[PDB]
Write a protein that binds this ligand. Structure first.
Ligand SMILES: Cc1cc2nc3c(=O)[nH]c(=O)nc-3n(C[C@H](O)[C@H](O)[C@H](O)COP(=O)(O)OP(=O)(O)OC[C@H]3O[C@@H](n4cnc5c(N)ncnc54)[C@H](O)[C@@H]3O)c2cc1C
Ligand SMILES: Cc1cc2nc3c(=O)[nH]c(=O)nc-3n(C[C@H](O)[C@H](O)[C@H](O)COP(=O)(O)OP(=O)(O)OC[C@H]3O[C@@H](n4cnc5c(N)ncnc54)[C@H](O)[C@@H]3O)c2cc1C
Ligand SMILES: CC(=O)O[C@@H](CC[C@H](C)CC[C@H](O)CC[C@H](C)CCNC(=O)[C@H](C)O)C[C@H]1O[C@H](O)[C@@H](C)C(=O)[C@@H]1C
Ligand SMILES: CC(=O)O[C@@H](CC[C@H](C)CC[C@H](O)CC[C@H](C)CCNC(=O)[C@H](C)O)C[C@H]1O[C@H](O)[C@@H](C)C(=O)[C@@H]1C
Ligand SMILES: [Ca+2]
Ligand SMILES: [Ca+2]
Ligand SMILES: [Ca+2]
Lengths: 428, 431
């Protein structure tokens, strides 16, 4: 594609913001964002404490230098620091001492499932040497108690508490175990961005300037003989190319083509609802947990026989975070609370949706290469890529590279490799 | 050209020797000479009498995992030996008030003081291999780390591998870098390690059983003299004749036993450096830290520590075996103190072992690789820690590399990570 083209990026989440940021180096870019900030799932909400204002990540928060080399380099290039926020996990079920945790060997669920936690690490480490985690567990003789009291809870930390996590791709889970992201024996190795995840997006927003249109949801995207027409904010805008950084769900709604292969490729993408509640109600902390960053509680009334229908809640104790250590205010995040959180203690709520990561869903992502470039249209974002923020931002980069702007970090071996892998995965 | 049914002696019955002999015996008439009363060397499990049974407590070698040690793991699996996760939780204590850090939680004044440095270090060790023939100390100096980090954090955590007498800050950087990137050592989590069920001695017990009368226990070799006919082994007041002789002893021992006019041997073997280690199996609970909660490894630096005299001062490392998951019902205290400064109450001491470890300075690695020049000459072969990558996998795989060269192929070719490790160690050894 020809230089100085008029390009629109639709959706200002991580993939869109990074796509736009790089595209603007060669093209006349405009970034449309439905909401009042750049970042989407990457949102840091200001909380007022006894130490000043903290920007508390409510969605996206975790990455590391190995898993997310491009995001890491981006942060580093921007002067943004990071810190280690280990994924310590405590799981509570109804009963007396019906728990296990990441940090120690205490709890009755640990006594009950000790052998299984052990074998699972071994097997996940031996695995990399296309099924679901559940199929694997069934097939390799793991107890139903392990599936629903250990596996499903630990996976909800990724997938949300409404997610059919046991149907998600095994390699996703195997890799997380072998890379020390999830573990039944130690707190996993993760980092957070200093000043919250929003910090890198703040800089992208500053760099893009008036090219960014906030609170401007795109209503329709209509390719024509002359170009592509974007209906947003009660006006009509004209472009040569349009980059989609929105979810497949949204993209289909916004897309206005006679072509019905679009309905085929974009319809049928499956999602999971997630509610993130930022609150100060300490009653959500476990009396046995407390110390653990991630605290999963399964409510009273759980039955193994009907486990498939029941769901818990996940609470994050932000006070455990090193930079929050002098803060005397409780800072808590409950994802998918079953009971209502005391609204006199609630700071803010966010409602989002995540993709399902079943092996069929992975096939569905890859197939999007068929419509890539057609009718002056491009696609990036989580639904075109590997899961996680690196996958998201790198998809944006893959599109920018295809549209003239090369991968910005070629001398960074792991960053370049990730770009190459994601470009291959996208079929671009 | 070496051929089948040769008379081969393996000198030294530690891990490398026992595995070398075990595989060699498939093709050759093998004899295994061992100085001590058991097969295993640094791999020693001592029986301890408790109210829930007699436990075989590893005093030396204890840790490995399925990724780091694929050949040993497969060997254990083939023998029907189970393993269990024994995470490397570490607690460090220095003389003041709450002058500690640990890798389970963010408590302690040393954590407060050095938290940011721990953090940067992880980042940098993870970024290192994707880019440096310095030592860990040179790195630390050069990348602006405080002296307090070098001696209150790095040196103590490194003693878990190296021993408390070790100049660990002189050891190769990539050794440390890899340990941090592979979650073996960490300032943020307990590292991923396994132990063998029934102790490490279990796999050796089986090798010993399989070898039978080919094993000569309590038979230290006095001299190894190559002749025009073959090689002569002087051991136990007798003279034994062999076609080939496989050395599985430390380089210093090898040079002492080795008897030739050739002085390239003196050049290649004479400059190997070691560190003494004393392992004390006891029941004196006064050695546990009052703050060092559930930590497996507990390092204590005695009163009188001075940062200026850090180079010459040394702590002690205590292992709390009662924290091990299979030892959870044991009411008896089971403890191992490495290099105790003060004497352990001898009315509470079960047994002591005295060993020596190699130094792993960048020069020492160069020295190991160099041993390819004498490999095969005068019917002589060399395996063991001083010819290989450090650790038990490196040790047992060196034994395998020699067995492969002498006709018996690597036993696990269809195990991709086991085969890869063999290939790497064979390349490193230059065999
Ligand atoms: C609660 C939660 C926690 C998470 N935690 C992590 C984590 O710790 N680590 C990690 O790696 N990943 C995490 N993720 C995954 C996350 O989805 C990805 O990391 C990444 O943020 C998704 O990138 P995206 O740009 O494709 O999606 P989004 O961030 O969802 O971006 C889509 C954007 O499109 C906008 N949009 C919608 N409609 C329109 C319209 N009509 N016109 C214009 N714009 C529109 C939206 O407002 C939004 O800004 C989390 C997700 C959730 C929901
Ligand atoms: C305290 C301690 C703890 C350790 N812990 C671990 C751990 O957890 N994990 C790990 O991977 N590694 C560990 N190691 C490292 C250890 O060096 C290797 O794992 C491995 O045991 C070395 O095996 P080797 O056969 O090369 O040497 P050694 O085990 O030292 O064996 C050499 C053998 O030669 C014999 N010998 C000596 N002189 C003569 C002679 N004249 N004639 C015949 N035989 C002789 C000795 O008795 C001995 O059995 C530890 C070492 C020590 C000292
Ligand atoms: C390295 C890289 O980018 O590639 C791998 C992806 C490994 C994942 C990205 C690791 C998971 C996320 O980064 C972490 C997501 C986050 C912590 C979940 C939601 N977070 C919260 O709720 C926080 C903890 O509060 C490849 C996998 O991606 C595919 O989507 C997946 C289904 C696979 O099959 C591949 C193995
Ligand atoms: C690939 C491989 O197998 O080896 C790598 C090094 C990683 C080590 C082998 C890990 C160290 C040991 O296996 C474990 C040491 C052990 C815990 C010793 C002491 N233990 C105790 O004293 C108590 C009982 O726990 C590569 C490095 O090996 C070399 O020896 C080293 C000097 C290097 O620089 C290489 C990079
Ligand atoms: Ca406080
Ligand atoms: Ca203080
Ligand atoms: Ca010292």
């Amino acid at each position: 594609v020809e230089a100085k083209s008029r390009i629109a990026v639709v959706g200002g989440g991580g993939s869109g913001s990074v796509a736009a940021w790089l595209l603007a180096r060669r093209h006349d870019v405009t970034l449309f964002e439905a909401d009042e900030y750049l970042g989407g799932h990457a949102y840091s909400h200001p909380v007022e404490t006894d130490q000043g204002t903290l920007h508390v990540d409510m969605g996206v928060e975790h990455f590391n230098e190995k898993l997310s080399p491009n995001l890491f380099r981006l942060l580093t290039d921007f002067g943004i620091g990071t810190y280690v926020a280990p994924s310590s996990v405590h799981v509570d079920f109804p009963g007396e001492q019906q728990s296990w945790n990441n940090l120690d060997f205490l709890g009755e669920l640990r006594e009950e499932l000790h052998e299984e936690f052990d074998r699972f690490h071994q097997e996940m480490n031996q695995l990399p040497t296309q099924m679901s985690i559940g199929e694997y567990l069934d097939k390799h003789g793991y107890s139903k108690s392990f599936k629903y009291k250990a596996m499903n809870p630990i996976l909800s930390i990724y997938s949300g508490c409404h997610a059919p996590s046991l149907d998600y791709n095994l390699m996703y889970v195997a890799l997380s175990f072998s890379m020390n992201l999830l573990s039944f024996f130690s707190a996993g190795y993760w980092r957070k961005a200093q000043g919250g995840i929003h910090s890198y997006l703040a800089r992208i927003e500053s760099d893009l300037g008036e090219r960014v249109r906030l609170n401007t949801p795109v209503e329709a995207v209509v390719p024509t003989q002359s170009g592509v027409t974007v209906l947003a904010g009660g006006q009509e805008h004209h472009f040569d190319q349009v980059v989609f950084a929105t979810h497949a769900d949204v993209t289909l709604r916004l897309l206005r083509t006679s072509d019905q292969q679009y309905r085929d490729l974009l319809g049928d993408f499956a999602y999971v609802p997630v509610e993130s509640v930022l609150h100060q109600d300490e009653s959500w902390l476990s009396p046995a947990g407390g110390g653990a960053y991630c605290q999963f509680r399964m409510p009273e009334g759980f039955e193994l026989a009907r486990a498939e229908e029941q769901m818990g809640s996940l609470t994050q104790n932000c006070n455990v975070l090193h930079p929050y250590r002098k803060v005397s205010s409780p800072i808590l995040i409950t994802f998918d609370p079953q009971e209502d959180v005391d609204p006199e203690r609630v700071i803010v709520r966010r409602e989002w949706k995540l993709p399902q990561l079943r092996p069929v869903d992975v096939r569905r992502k890859k197939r999007l290469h068929e419509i890539q470039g057609l009718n002056g249209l491009w696609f990036c974002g989580t639904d075109t890529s590997v899961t996680g923020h690196e996958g998201a931002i790198v998809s944006g980069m893959v599109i920018a590279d295809r549209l003239g702007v090369p991968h910005p970090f070629p001398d960074d071996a792991p960053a370049a490799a990730q770009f190459r892998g994601i470009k291959e995965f996208m079929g671009v």
